[PDB]
Structure formats: structure tokens, C-alpha cells
Amino acid sequence: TSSIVHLCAISLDRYWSITQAIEYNLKRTPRR
């Protein structure tokens, strides 16, 4: 129970900053 969150704490941040500024790198240099 407690031996999870701690982990989730690690395997999460990675997908935090990006999320926030995801639009920053989504569909750059659009070709149309």
C-alpha cells in the first residue's frame, strides 16, 4: 500500500512537466 505511492512518485514526474507544457512540443513545423 505504502510501497506504491513512493514509486508512483518517481514514475510520474517524468510525465508532469511535459504534460503542463505539452503543447510546447506536439505538432511543430506543420505541413499543409
6 Cβ partners below 8 Å, 6+ apart? none
25 Cβ partners below 8 Å, 6+ apart? 18
Dist CA 32 CA 28 (whole Å): 12
CA 27 to each of CA 6, 22, 23, 24: distance values in angstroms, whole numbers, following the listed order: 33, 10, 8, 9
DSSP string, the chain: -HHHHHHHHHHHHTTTHHHHT-GGGSS-S---
Hey, what's the cell of 20?
A: 503542463
- Residue whose grid cell is 514514475: 11
Hey, what's the cell of 13?
A: 514526474
